[PDB]
């Protein structure tokens, strides 16, 4: 997380951490608890090539990474079959835990937005995670979960910004329709926050508008963060995750 701050223990009860087996269960991507048994995340975090379930684990809301580990096995890795690369799109995936977690005030699910939700540009939203605090700048131990308020930005504005200082024809879409865009030159998600959630507060309720997907550097001018648009894939998500 770039330009943010450590998050109070009572916020972001749905933030989760993905671990990969090695010398230790290292964090490699974030996720969000959208149902007692399901974690929503980015496809590029677990694909497009098939991974080994035994090498994957999920960690629920931890104030400081690795410190109070209680790793949970995964039962299924479901990646959108549309996915190949984050630039192409459909960067989204679902993880099915072996057991439903015991919902609590400290750790519980985030609410998916209704298929009609729009999330107007300018609206205050938040992105959270344990990613780098800046370009090639690792989150220092004790690894606190960070947060930062980023403004959503209309798809066409971002797509346009991405053409500024680039060779791609303006008529060629870079920021696609199944994508969402947020952040600025001082606030944004970073390497390590991938698959993490972008949440906004609407009717006095936190709805996940996006999933950290890709971009060009952390908090870079004319290169706002690109997130997988959640509303666009509700139907696919509901083919697995009970409503």
């Amino acid at each position: 997380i770039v330009g943010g701050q450590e998050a109070p223990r009572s916020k972001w009860p749905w933030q989760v951490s993905l671990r990969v087996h090695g010398p230790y269960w290292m964090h490699f991507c974030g996720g969000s608890l959208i149902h007692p048994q399901w974690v929503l995340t980015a496809a590029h975090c677990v694909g497009p090539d098939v991974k080994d379930l035994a090498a994957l684990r999920v960690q629920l809301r931890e104030q400081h990474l690795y410190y109070q580990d209680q790793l949970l096995p995964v039962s299924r890795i479901i990646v959108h079959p549309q996915f190949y690369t984050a630039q192409i799109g459909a960067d989204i995936a679902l993880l099915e835990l072996e057991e439903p977690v015991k919902v609590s005030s400290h750790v519980h699910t985030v609410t998916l937005p209704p298929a009609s939700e729009t999330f107007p540009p300018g609206m205050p939203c938040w992105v959270t995670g344990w990613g780098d605090v800046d370009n090639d700048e690792r989150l220092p131990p004790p690894f606190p979960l960070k947060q930062v308020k980023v403004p959503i930005m209309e798809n066409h504005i971002c797509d346009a910004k991405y053409h500024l200082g680039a060779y791609t024809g303006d008529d060629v879409r870079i920021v696609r329709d199944d994508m969402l865009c947020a952040g600025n030159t001082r606030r944004d998600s970073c390497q390590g926050d991938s698959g993490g959630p972008l949440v906004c507060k609407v009717n006095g309720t936190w709805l996940q508008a996006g999933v950290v997907s890709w971009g060009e550097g952390c908090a870079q001018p004319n290169r706002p963060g690109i997130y997988t648009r959640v509303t666009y894939y509700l139907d696919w998500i509901h083919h697995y995750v009970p409503k």
Copy 2:
């Protein structure tokens, strides 16, 4: 170049090395001389973002990298307007030198192929460059120009292969029509060979079939090398390079 050997100094007179300004003018991509004033390379080597032409220089055919440098400045960088990522396609670009170069039997242009050429499987083709000799394995100094004969395989065949061991739905094309694939578990190009040429001797004359574009590792099973198909972009090339 993985596999293969050191190229005879009489071979590949069109092979060029693109250099980036830093501690020294380091090699970062390949390219080919197609006209006394033009170089063909991969768009991802110089884009999609606009870089400073002042920090770019071209080095003509060199048996050993950095040893006989005579850097040539660049006046224009023309990247196919449809490019954004090698996976999406249009991984091709043109470099106009500030002055025309003098050709000889040791250094001259490569012949582009007619729009009808397909380069069917079983076709003899070679790929050359100064890239790694294996995954995470740099070409050791004196950095000789390497070459390697690679087997050409039908797009369709390579597409299926790329779907093996992947979550990507079978009907979602990975290896696109504007692409070409060649190589196997022993022969292939590697990081640092990008933008370089893949040539095939057709009816006694070398034609450039493709440009080193991307893949998923070097000489990995079910992941053959992917090249930008030159025939697909002839019209674009001629809007800039004299016939």
Copy 3:
């Protein structure tokens, strides 16, 4: 620490962690509390060149590094005047904290040995720290304090071992008299444990026999760990630390 286990929370109340200012207050060496206002460590950890005291802080007993940080500023760095390199000897130093620390059953000083104490081979001694668990592999997060029992051996026995597989003449002392040696191929200290303590329970109480100083690799054949012999420098220590 190689070949040990996480230390019980009630053990090694004198363990200290030295921190250097940078992206974050990183741990570079161990040390021990020998007085409410003094820390004993290795001179190579802070010398022979004078460093800025502002860039140095001390962390008292922590089960896991960085978790419960409560850094303490240092007012004085006193290095034995005869030190220049660990191999030559006198690898010992003292740190005077800016304020006295409150001692408790969980954090208090270690007892120094009587000038006559000669920890005979066969002495049950332990070494502790937050250093690597092997040659080239860092202690993984959450970085627990580790301990490991190590066998003490006669100086002359270790000295002869050091001459095995070396060109150094047999009569040229390698393991000096102001040094102590312990450990084998399965138990030893490592990079990051330097300055830390080696303690033996002698007649009911724990006495610090040495200061983790140097060696040739961690847990390597014929190259047992080398520690500064505390008894040798007792007089020097009392020139600065009260009773």
Copy 4:
């Protein structure tokens, strides 16, 4: 070599490069040809531990490293038996080639100074090699042999300087009597130059006054280059190297 220049092709005919086996015969230290069959170099380059002859090779004067390689096997590694570390002293070794070299005006032995030569402070001397051009700054390819004029300096003066900004007591020797020192804050040898020659022309004759041994940062204020004084070990050198 820091603050130096690429050596002309006719200077330094005795400069040799030491190669260690791996992905390629990599340079790791310099040396000097003092006899048709003998190479002089620093003990620390090949000790104190016993190395395998098979893995070692010598390369005579090369304008650019790795370019015209003609690797010569070594028949015997002779390390001064008083040697353990460069700071302690006797940092000198002899390499015996399997075959005497056929000398020419372009490649030939350097002259050792007689036991009486002194090389007074402020003497015009040069150090050469292929080491770093600065602190942690590799010699960029094509790897030209560099040279720099360094001013010799009285032993007591260097020893004095090394004590400035250090805890070592003033009466404790750091720059010992079997060492010599040259250089300043702009010119000095660097990592990679080790074992290389320090030559001075006395009465129209180049004499090797020292062997690059150790120091504290390349061209650092008050930390001049320390070299193993050759005169001090003539007797040892002649126990093997015929006059």
